[PDB]
Structure formats: C-alpha cells, structure tokens
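FAQ
Q: What does a multi-component entry look like?
A: The components come first, one per line:
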Amino acid sequence: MAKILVLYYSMYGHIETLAGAIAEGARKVSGVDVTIKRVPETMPAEAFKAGGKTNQQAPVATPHELADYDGIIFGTPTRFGNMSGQMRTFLDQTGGLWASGALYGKVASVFASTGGGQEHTITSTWTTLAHHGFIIVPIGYGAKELFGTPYGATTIARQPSAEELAIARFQGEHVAKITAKLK
Amino acid sequence: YFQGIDPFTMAKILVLYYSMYGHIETLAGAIAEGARKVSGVDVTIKRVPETMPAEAFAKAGGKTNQQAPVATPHELADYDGIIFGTPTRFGNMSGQMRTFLDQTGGLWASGALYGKVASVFASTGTGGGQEHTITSTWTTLAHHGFIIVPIGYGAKELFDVSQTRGGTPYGATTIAGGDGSRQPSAEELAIARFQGEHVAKITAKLKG
Amino acid sequence: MAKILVLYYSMYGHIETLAGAIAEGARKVSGVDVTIKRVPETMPAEAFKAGGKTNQQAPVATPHELADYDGIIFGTPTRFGNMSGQMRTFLDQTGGLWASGALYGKVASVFASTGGGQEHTITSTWTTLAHHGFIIVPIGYGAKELFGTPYGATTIARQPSAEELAIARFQGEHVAKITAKLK
Amino acid sequence: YFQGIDPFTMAKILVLYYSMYGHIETLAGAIAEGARKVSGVDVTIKRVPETMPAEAFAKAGGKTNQQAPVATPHELADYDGIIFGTPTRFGNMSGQMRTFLDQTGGLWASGALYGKVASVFASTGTGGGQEHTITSTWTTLAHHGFIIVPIGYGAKELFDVSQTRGGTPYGATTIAGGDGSRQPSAEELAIARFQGEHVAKITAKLKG
Ligand SMILES: [Cl-]
Ligand SMILES: [Cl-]
Ligand SMILES: [Cl-]
Ligand SMILES: [Cl-]
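Then the predicted structure of the entire assembly, as tokens:
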C-alpha cells in the first residue's frame, strides 16, 4: 500500500495551503496513505515579530523519518533564489540516510512559492535529491491551468489562487499514481 | 479493439544519442547492455541526424561508421523510456540533439511523451560542463512531462577516484580528451551499465 | 574608449524594446560606444504566419564579430525553459572564438523575456559564457524597481512596462561602467 | 574628510573558506598565492565558524588546527573582492558557508556588497556536484550584486585529463576522496593559483 509524505516549510501560510492541495490530490489514488508534516523552524521564536503564522497544525518531521515513505513531495518558499534555509537545513541533516542509501529509488517531487525565483528553487532541489538517488517527477503540462510551472506547482506569496491549487492537486495525484505503481 | 490489443506487453527503451568521435556511441552500447539485463524490456539504439556539413565532419576526423539507425522525432512516442546521450556544447546539450528535440513540438502539443521515463548520459573533452549538460537537459525534458531518473551513488565505481573517471549522480559520463583521443574506461562503462539497468527496472515496473 | 554590443533575439518585439533601454543605459556612460544587433532568425521566413515582427531595424550580427566588443549584453526570449533556439544556435557557432580564447575576460550580462522561466534562461546563459571566460555581471537590487530579477532585466511577453524598462536602463549603465573601468 | 581619505588605495581580496578536513584550506592558500602576484592587492585569508558540535567534528577526524582567523559577517563589506571556498553539501555550498552568508542580510539590505568582485572554489569527495556547488553559489552572490568571475579555460592544466584532477571553467576544485584521504594535486593548486591571480587583476583594475 504506498506511503506519501507531503513535507513543507511555510512562514506566512502560502505553502501550507498548497501542501493541503498536494495532499488532497495524492489521496485521490486508491491505496495511497498521505501524511503532511512541516520541517522545524530555524528562526528564534520571537523573531518569527516578522508576522509568521504560528498556528500550523501539521506535525513537525525529523530527517530520520524520510526513510518510512515511498514518495516525498517537498514544499518550500524561495530564499534569495534558492530553497528556504529551513528546508535546506533539514536536507543538510540527511548524511546518515545518504551513506546507507536509505532514500535510493524513492519518488520525489517539489512545489515552491515565489520570493523571486521559483524555478531555480525547484530545479536546485532536484539536483540535491539526485545525490540521494531519488526518482524525480516534474508535472509537465498535464494540468490545463498551465496554459505554476512544468517543474512543479508554485504560488506567488495574498493567498494561493484556485488555478494554483488545481495544479497542486494534479501534482499530488500524478506523483501518487507513479509511487503506487512503483510499489 | 478486438485484435489490435496485444496479450503481452514489453517496456520499450530507446537509447537515443549523438556522437561525433564515438565516445557517446560506446557509452550508448553499455547503457543498452544494462537495460537488456531486465526481463520484459525491449532495447533499441538510435542516433539523431548530423547537422554539420559532411565535409567539415570528415575533415574534423568524425566517425561516419555508426551502425545505429537514424531516429525520427515522431517515433519517440512509441517508447516507454528514453535514455538520451550527448556530448556537451558549453555546458548544454549538443546542437545536434537540441535540433532533434526542437522537432518534437508536435509531440509536446499532444502530450505524446507525457509520463514516460527519461535519463541522460554525456561526454565532454575535459570534464568541463558535464554535470550541467545533464541537468539542463532535465529541464527541457520536464516540459514534455518526463519522469527524470538520476543514478545517485548506486554504481560503486563512482567512489573510485584513483583514475580519470566520468560518471556523476546525475548520469553516466565519459571524458574524451580535448582532442577526443581518450577511450571510455571500464569503470565509465560499468556506471553506464548500471544506469541502463536502473532505468529499465523503473520503466518495466511502471509498465507492468 | 569601450565598446558594448547589445545582442538580442526577438520574435514579437518585447526583447527588442528592452534592448533599446539596455542600450540607452549604457550610452549614459562617457566614452562608451554602444551597438545594437540581432542574431539571425532560424525559422523559415513564411512560418515566422506565426505573427512575427518582421520590421526590426537592428542589423544582423555574425558570431565572428563578438571579438570586436569589450562587453556584450545578451537578450533572449525563453524557449521551454532555456534560451531561445536562435540565440543558442548563434552561441553554438563560437567554437573558433573559444579555441583561440578570443572572448576571454570580456564582460557579459543577460536579459530575458518570460515564456515560463526567465531565471533559468539567464543563469544557464551564464554557465555557457563561463566556458568562454566571460566576466559575468548580475544586477542585484541596484534598481529600486526590484523592490525584473537580480540576475538581469526581464519582461513578461503586451509591451514591457516602464518598471521593466527602468531596470533594463540600470543594467545597461551598470554593465557599461564596469566595462569602461576594465578597459 | 580632510584626514580620513587615504593617498593610496589597495584592492582588498578576502579568501573566505570553510574546510573540515583541510582540502579547501590548502586550495585557499594557492588562491591567495595567486592573488599576491598582483601589484597593489592586499590578500587576507579567513574561515567561517564551525556549525557542528566540537565532539562530532573531532570524532569525525576534522582538522581543528586551522590558523586562519574566523571571519565576521559584517567585515565582508571591507573588501573589494571575495573568493569563496567550500566543500559541497549535495551539490550546494556547505551548511557552514550557507549559515555564514545567511548572516549578511544586513549587508544585503544596505547594498554594502554591491558591485564587489566574487569568485568560487569547491571540494567534493568524488567529484559529484562540484560544478553545481559553484554555480548555485553564484546565484546567491547575485542577490548581493556581486560581479561573478569564472575562470574559463585560462589555466591550461584544465586540458590535462591524464590523472584525477579537480578544476572547472566555473572555478577551481579539488577531489578529496569519499574518505578525505586524497591530497590536493599540483595541477589543482596551479588552477587555483590562476584563479586568484585572475580575480585579483580584475579587482585591482576596477579599484585603480
Ligand atoms: Cl510561505
Ligand atoms: Cl562523443
Ligand atoms: Cl520577444
Ligand atoms: Cl575540504
């Protein structure tokens, strides 16, 4: 039965909302169990005075647990053209998983919010995931709302639009179909 | 359709390459050998058309003796996985491979390649730009909706640094020398053999 | 006295207009001679039925002449996430310049229009130019309209906005100051 | 200001690095040697703070004997060119270098680094991700408005493929081995020496 983790970071809630649509799409696939988790905050609690959304219901993930899922869909804001420092720090802590090959051949996909360079954020995440041997799922133009990027769903952070959310649902279903078929 | 539907399916792998001096042709053979290890997989090797003048090619020492047939853009739609091989042009795919992929706009418009499996291998003269040749190709393939297969560190020859050695976590590679005089090494061929098998297992599993 | 080439490709005219602002900014620098040229079209004349802008006054450049300038500012639309095939084909034809080191240490900068991934188009052009040994000029946040990308001016192709054109003028001046100082 | 203004200027180069096992520290020395060949250039080597626990570092065999002083984020504003050195973390800069650059948000907000010269050198265990470590760092530096210096094929050692050899057109590199047991080679040190001289000439010319 396949297990999908929707793992995200969100400061203002935009990526949180997109992750909900990602998960919704993946749950459309029979026999797929979907879990939503957030990576730990890296800023001090009082600075996060920056207007951060402290009311986030998703449980906090640990790097250790990435090995328990068959597919992982990563969501992140952009920071100075790259993935958020929060998501980067989390992935920087997977050296034990790397050395043991624990993530090898698992399915990965990425969604992002525009800080702003959404596309480099996704493709640079792809580069990092390649080092673990993940199979990488772009979305192409399968969602008709693309006529969002072909690399993965995105939003411009002021809530995500219905069109952006439709593309995220498509991505979640697409990734989950592939993961379930590979399992 | 009462007779059009086959009782058995195979996963169809195309190894599509461009090579001027043969280095990628040789890796393409190892890619295919690896894919052939997988039960239920058909493997085909084809090359993209030459774009340079024939006299320039021959005067530059090019290898005109390449037996693989020339591919048509349209037929990529007939395969389940496509492993693309190319020399670099300043960190990008060859003009030859790029020109060929530019002729798949009709396949793009109809979604004909959507959800197929893709993987990339490359050559450079000195190593320069080998990684970006692969990852920039990924970007183009994402617009067709291909699933992208890197190799990670699955081939242990990637940890050997005792000799000049192509191969990256993004895909197999070979180092030809600035003049093309280096031959692909046994370690480079092994990494390419791993890539083909890996890609074919994934493709076969998705087709099963 | 420093020589800047503004070299662009444009199908619908958006990049042509941005190139005019690039050149305008560079001409603000005393002692800088600025030339605007376009790369040759690669499509057949009748297809370019696609609504192309045939009335483009800029002369057509040859790859050979890149060696005659001290700085080159490259403008291109995006194609399927990368530089236009027209600009790529032009750069693919610089192998003789590469082998002789003719472009080594010259100044380069890039502007793009969104097809759509403007940022990968610019940074992938940077990668190609590195192989020739160009010095690469981003624009950062020097133009206050950025608060366009920090990698170079951009437009969304439906004419370029005054804000986009202001950023292009800034880029042209910035690049030309650097080129003149290096000469 | 009647006395604050100096009669003579020097171009100030900072070689800023992170190194766990010393490979990048050794290349940083060659970078600096090269920059020192240029008349009118002051060269300073500094390292970014360690982020890992001291006991983990020492138990992993880390090199605690590094004489270069530890840099502060704020002082990057005092230099004219900065050559950044780092091991890779999965195709990205080290967490240590990244954490340090994250503390330059104040310099970013005031434009303090705008228009300075930047260049990058890197290490990997097997070569994997060496190119992307450099080019992804370029992207971060572009947000500060740095001028970016690749090295192209100016160092002829880049054409030698007879031995395992770091170095790319994006910047110098070294191959440490998966266990860190390889030492930087004379060819790798020469390429780094070229990079430092090249960067310093460019910086000196812009300061003149
Ligand atoms: Cl957010
Ligand atoms: Cl080849
Ligand atoms: Cl245009
Ligand atoms: Cl190191």
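Q: Is there any commentary attached?
A: Sometimes. For this entry: The pocket of chloride ion (ligand 3) is lined by residues C 10-12, 14-15, 77, 113, 157 (CB under 6 Å).
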